[PDB]
Structures are given as structure tokens and as C-alpha cells.
Homo-oligomer: 155 residues x 2
Amino acid sequence: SNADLLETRHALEGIAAYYAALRSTDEDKERIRELHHAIELAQQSGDLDAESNAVLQYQIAVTEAAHNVVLLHLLRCMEPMLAQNVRQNFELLYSRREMLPLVSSHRTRIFEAIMAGKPEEAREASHRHLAFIEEILLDRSREESRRERSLRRLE
Amino acid sequence: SNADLLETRHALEGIAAYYAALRSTDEDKERIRELHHAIELAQQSGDLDAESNAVLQYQIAVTEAAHNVVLLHLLRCMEPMLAQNVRQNFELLYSRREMLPLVSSHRTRIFEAIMAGKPEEAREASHRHLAFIEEILLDRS
């Protein structure tokens, strides 16, 4: 399920961000800065597949920067489904382009908390980032449900 | 380490218990009851390796009973390290035998919440169960 997977990323990306904040070296923090900025460039060029891959690579670097053997192993284990989930999320976000900045905004609060070495904040930022995506997905479902329900109820 | 792994189970076993409570069939709940009782028998015989395997099998059944494809995939993925973590935890618990009953006690609140079909209680029970183990590990060194 694409639903069950989000709840799992919710859990695992939070802890990833936590340890990344606490254990990232100076080289890690720099390699992450370039990957975070790569997301912005892909978003401004308006290329969905480019931005989707930029996010996947960012999240991998964050996980490696966490230096937690089991977490990295779990990411690699689900990497194909994760890559698919991010791609699907962005297909729905590119439908409502006004949300993209707000999503990147949430993701940037995680990045900034990692660079700053604040674990608690980084984890809470990740929860809110993914929680906010779940909310956008549910609004698509809700409005498309009203769509049919309302246009059918008129007579 | 043994520490990082606990935080990972903390997360994943909570969600496992949640869905197990919500989605377990009658056959699942029964297969889990036999595995839970098997832990008690292994504990009373005082056999560490037997009780360690009983817990591993219990947790697998709980995960399967959750009917959540990604969770099961993640368990299988880390199964070797998980089996090792449980075995190591019990080596430290068998050092302070007075804790064993309290650990089984916490784990039984999860089981009971699953049989009863109460997801939020089952998840909260799992957090307290593993949180309590993390505390015992930190007191060791």
C-alpha cells in the first residue's frame, strides 16, 4: 500500500533526521547542502522527474549521514518502493503547483535543523513535513469524492 | 550498535502492534496466543536460548498478523540483526533475573491489547515495553 509506506517513512525518516543532526561530519553536512540545493534547481526548471530524483538522493545522503547501520539497511531494503512513493507524491504535487513551495519549505526546516545540529527539531520537522504531504493527498481524495458526489446529487 | 537497533524496533514494533490489533483474524490471534504462552514456558524452564527464540517467533507472528506488506519486508530485511538483538538483550536480562517478570509483564500488556483489538493501547504498550528495555541497557554501563 502507498498508505502503509508513508507511515513507515514517517517513522524511519524522523529517526534518520535525528541521528543525522547528531552524527553528521563536516563533509556530510556539505554533501547534503549540495543535494538540498539541487532540489531547488530541479523545482525551478519545472522538471518533475529531476526533482523527484533530487529528493531521493537527498534522503539517502541524510540517512548515510546518520551513521546508523540498521537504518541505512532498511532504506536500501525499501529503496525501490521509496523511489516510487516520492515519484507518485510529486505527480500529485505537480497537479497543484502552488503547494510545491510549501513542501520544500517544510523539508528546508529539517535540513536547517540538521546543519544546526538540533536533533529534536530535526525529527519534529520531518514528522510535520510528511504529515503535511499526507494531508495534501487526502484533500485530493476528498475533493475528487465531492466532485462525483456533488455533480451526481444535482438531479 | 545494540542501542540504535532498539530505537528502530521501538518505531517499527509499535506500528506492528497497532495494525496487528486492527487487522488480526481469529486464526492469527490464536497462533499468537500459543506463541505468547510458549515464552512463559521457556522462561519458567530457565532456558535463555529457548526464550530468546520464543520471543523472535512471537514478534514475527505479530508482524504477519498486521497484514502490512512493508513492515513484514522490513522485519525480514533486519531479521538476522533482530534475532541477535533479542538474544543479547536476554543475556543482559538473565544477569538480573528480577527484571524478567517485569519485561514479560510489559510484553503481555501488548498481547492483551492485540487480542482485545485496541490499537492505540497496543502501540503505547510496545513503546513502554521497549523503552523499559532501553532503560535497563543504559543502567548496565
